[PDB]
Write a protein that binds this ligand. Structure first.
Ligand SMILES: CCc1ccccc1-c1c(Cl)cc(CNCCc2nc3ccccc3[nH]2)cc1Cl
Length: 327
C-alpha cells in the first residue's frame, strides 16, 4: 500500500493545542443579530455559498456576507472554527459576525469589507515589484495558517482579495480549509482543477500544508508567464498530463515510486514520455519584464512533484525573489 507521509513542519501544533481548538464539531456557535445587516447586492454564487455586499447598520460600515447553501450547511462548523482560530492573523480575512439568514435558514458569515481592485486590471497591470510584494503578503497568510495547524486547500486568484490602492491583501474562502493531523487521510477532491497539486491528482490522501505551496506556484507561473492558467487541463486526468509536459514524466514516476503510489491505469494511454522543460522555454517578449533568474529559482522550488521537497511558506519568505520588497 501507500507509504505514509507527514509534514516536515508544524506537525505537532494540533497535539500541542487543546482539543477545543481543533474539535470543531464540539464548538457552540454564538449567533449575532441578522437585523444589523442590510444586503446591498449579490457579488457571486458558487457551489457552496452566495456572497453579498452589505452594510452593518450599527456602524454604517460596508461588510461582506456569505450565505451558506444547505449542501454546505453541514461542515459550517469547520469553517467557523477555522475562521475564529485565525482571526487577527496577517492577511487573513476577519470574521466579524455569524447570523442566521431568515430566508435560507442557514448560517451567514459576516466579514470585513475589502474594496477589491478589478481582477483583470490587477493581472494586466501589476509590476514585477507588485507581484513580489503581493506574493510576500500571501506567504505571510500561509505561514500563519500553517503554523496554526490549518491548510487552506483552495488557494487560487479568486480566493485572494486585493485592494491595490491600500496595498491590502486578504486570503478568503476558508470553507475547504482543514486542520492538519499527521497520518490523516484527506479527501483528494479539494481546490480548483488548475491549482490541484500532483498529490491530489495521483490520489495520495496523506497530504499536508505543502499542497497550498503548489497552488501558490501555479498562481505565480500564470502571472509571470502571462499564461492563464499555467497548467490548463481539460479534466483532472489531463491536468496531470499538462503538469508532466512541463516537469517531465521521469520525476513523476520517481514521486509515485517513492510513496508506492499506483497511477490510475487510465494514465497508460495518455501520459506518454516527456522530458522536464527548462523554465526559460516559457519566456517571450511579452513577459520578459516579469521574469528574472530569482523568479524562476523560486518557482522551481514550489513546483515540485514531491510534496515533502517544496519550499515551506516561512523558508520561501527568505528567498532572494523577495529581497527587493520593502519590509
Ligand atoms: C494571478 C494571481 C496572482 C499572482 C501573483 C500576484 C498577484 C496575483 C493576483 C491577482 Cl493578479 C489578482 C487577484 C485578485 N483576485 C480577486 C478575487 C476576488 N475578488 C472578489 C470580490 C468579491 C467576492 C469574492 C472575490 N474574490 C489576486 C491575486 Cl493573488
Amino acid at each position: 500500500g501507500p507509504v505514509p507521509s507527514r509534514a516536515r513542519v508544524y506537525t505537532d501544533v494540533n497535539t500541542h493545542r487543546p482539543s477545543e481548538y481543533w474539535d470543531y464539531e464540539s464548538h457552540v456557535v454564538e449567533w449575532g443579530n441578522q437585523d444589523d445587516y442590510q444586503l446591498v447586492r449579490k457579488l457571486g454564487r458558487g457551489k457552496y455559498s452566495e456572497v453579498f455586499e452589505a452594510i452593518n447598520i450599527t456602524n454604517n460600515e460596508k461588510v461582506v456576507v456569505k450565505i451558506l447553501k444547505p449542501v454546505a450547511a453541514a461542515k459550517i462548523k469547520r469553517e467557523i472554527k477555522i475562521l475564529e482560530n485565525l482571526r487577527g492573523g496577517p492577511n487573513i480575512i476577519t470574521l466579524a459576525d455569524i447570523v442566521k439568514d431568515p430566508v435560507s435558514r442557514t448560517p451567514a458569515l459576516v466579514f470585513e469589507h475589502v474594496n477589491n481592485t478589478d481582477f483583470k486590471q490587477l493581472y494586466q497591470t501589476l509590476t514585477d515589484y507588485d507581484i513580489r510584494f503581493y506574493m510576500y503578503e500571501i506567504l505571510k497568510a500561509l505561514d500563519y495558517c500553517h503554523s496554526m495547524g490549518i491548510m487552506h486547500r483552495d488557494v487560487k486568484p479568486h480566493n485572494v482579495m486585493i485592494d491595490h490602492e491600500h496595498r491590502k491583501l486578504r486570503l478568503i474562502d476558508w470553507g475547504l480549509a482543514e486542520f492538519y493531523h499527521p497520518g490523516q487521510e484527506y479527501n483528494v477532491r479539494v481546490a480548483s482543477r488548475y491549482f490541484k497539486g500532483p498529490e491530489l491528482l495521483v490520489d495520495y490522501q496523506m497530504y499536508d500544508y505543502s499542497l497550498d505551496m503548489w497552488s501558490l506556484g501555479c498562481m505565480l507561473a500564470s502571472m509571470i508567464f502571462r499564461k492563464e492558467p499555467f497548467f490548463h487541463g481539460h479534466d483532472n486526468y489531463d491536468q496531470l498530463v499538462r503538469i508532466a509536459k512541463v516537469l517531465g514524466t521521469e520525476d513523476l514516476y520517481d514521486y509515485i515510486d517513492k510513496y508506492n503510489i499506483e497511477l490510475d491505469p487510465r494514465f497508460n494511454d495518455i501520459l506518454g514520455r516527456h522530458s522536464r522543460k527548462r523554465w526559460e522555454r516559457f519566456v517571450h517578449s511579452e513577459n520578459q519584464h516579469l521574469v528574472s533568474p530569482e523568479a524562476l529559482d523560486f518557482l522551481d522550488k514550489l513546483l515540485r512533484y514531491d510534496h515533502q521537497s517544496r519550499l515551506t511558506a516561512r523558508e520561501a519568505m527568505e528567498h532572494p525573489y523577495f529581497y527587493t520588497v520593502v519590509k
